[PDB]
């Protein structure tokens, strides 16, 4: 049968506005290998995204790393969007980061 992907989003360095960084999305434990992965900025697809070569784990489930270099600011929200035969609809996992105290 088929195996639905696990999706995990992380940055390479602590988030700091106006400083270059890397957004990663690690997608793993899925089968079959046909998969569609996008990195989003403000809900719009980012165009320069690299990914590692497809590989598989001991249990034969596949995994991939998608990543792009980026500079965050205080407006922008980032996410990873995946689609797979096991999914009714594309699943979206956000990059969680702190924005600081709301109250001045």
């Amino acid at each position: 049968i088929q195996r639905t992907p696990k999706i995990q989003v992380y940055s390479r360095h602590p988030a700091e506005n106006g400083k270059s960084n890397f957004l990663n999305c690690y997608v793993s434990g899925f089968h079959p290998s046909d998969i569609e992965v996008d990195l989003l900025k403000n809900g719009e697809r980012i165009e320069k995204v690299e990914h590692s070569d497809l590989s598989f784990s001991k249990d034969w489930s596949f995994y991939l790393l998608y990543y792009t270099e980026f500079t965050p600011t205080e407006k922008d929200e980032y996410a990873c969007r995946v689609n797979h035969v096991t999914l009714s609809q594309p699943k979206i996992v956000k990059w969680d980061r702190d924005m600081g105290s709301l109250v001045p």
Partner: protein
């Protein structure tokens, strides 16, 4: 630390397929195959070992002969084997030293057949389809003999020229970097404290939330995740009652630090102070 080759072949329909081949040192990729131009590509300078270009030209042509022949072979007997389109065949083969060696094949993401000393054995749960596939795979003994010497002679010899050549790379120590943030899914009246640790190599690492000297056993360590530069990432999260987040710190131990642990405190805007 086990060097191995992986083979991914995806049969979408009777006349459309995808093919991927790569070589690996444990977690670390070292080689790739290019379907265009049929070239073995070396991801690192030390990926070649002490081996000569005249020997790589032969490996490539053996890889290509087998890679291409494995294609139309699967395509011809796909009905006599009850293979249904679409379907994927995965193979992993390699060796481990101090001594072992392996070659395993999966169909549709499950154990199907494997290579034991001199021939292909079907996995007994895989059923009669796998028994028939071993029949085709074992039709020529000389080919099976050549598969034996690759695992028994050629593979351990390559691990020679590889681990020695790449010692400076696999024995480096890259110090980690850490930071703290609020986790997204706390229960009511509670907080989730997140300690991120990135940029470290090699892989083994230690991270715990602490109250001074006392390890907080609620610390939940996630998966170690890769980066394109070869280093690893990890999050360790702790859920706490909202006021009870005083005096908490995150502590990281890693071989590269020489005893100088990283200690970060849940403080400042995080708390937040006055």
């Amino acid at each position: 630390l086990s060097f191995h080759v992986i083979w991914i072949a995806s049969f979408y329909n009777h006349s459309w397929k995808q093919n991927l081949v790569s070589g690996w040192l444990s977690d670390l990729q070292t080689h790739t195959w290019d379907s265009n131009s049929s070239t073995i590509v070396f991801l690192w300078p030390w990926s070649r070992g002490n081996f000569s270009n005249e020997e790589w030209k032969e490996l490539e042509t053996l890889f290509r002969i087998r890679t291409i022949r494995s294609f139309e072979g699967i395509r011809r007997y796909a009905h006599e084997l009850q293979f249904e389109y679409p379907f994927e065949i995965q193979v992993t083969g390699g060796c481990e030293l101090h001594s072992g060696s392996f070659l395993q094949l999966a169909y549709q993401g499950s154990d199907f057949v494997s290579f034991q000393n001199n021939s292909w054995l079907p996995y007994p749960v895989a059923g009669n389809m796998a028994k028939h596939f071993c029949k085709v795979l074992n039709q020529n003994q000389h080919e099976n003999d050549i598969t034996h010497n690759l695992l028994s002679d050629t593979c351990p010899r390559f691990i020679l020229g590889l681990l020695d050549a790449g010692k400076a790379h696999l024995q480096r120590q890259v110090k980690p970097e850490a930071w703290l943030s609020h986790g997204p899914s706390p229960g009511p009246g509670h907080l989730q404290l997140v300690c991120h640790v990135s940029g470290f190599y090699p892989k083994p690492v230690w991270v715990m939330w602490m109250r001074g000297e006392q390890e907080q056993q609620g610390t939940q360590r996630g998966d170690i995740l890769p980066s394109a530069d070869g280093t690893w990432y990890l999050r360790a999260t702790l859920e706490v009652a909202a006021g009870e987040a005083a005096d908490l710190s995150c502590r990281v131990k890693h071989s590269s630090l020489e005893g100088q642990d990283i200690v970060l405190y849940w403080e400042g805007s995080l708390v937040p102070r006055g």
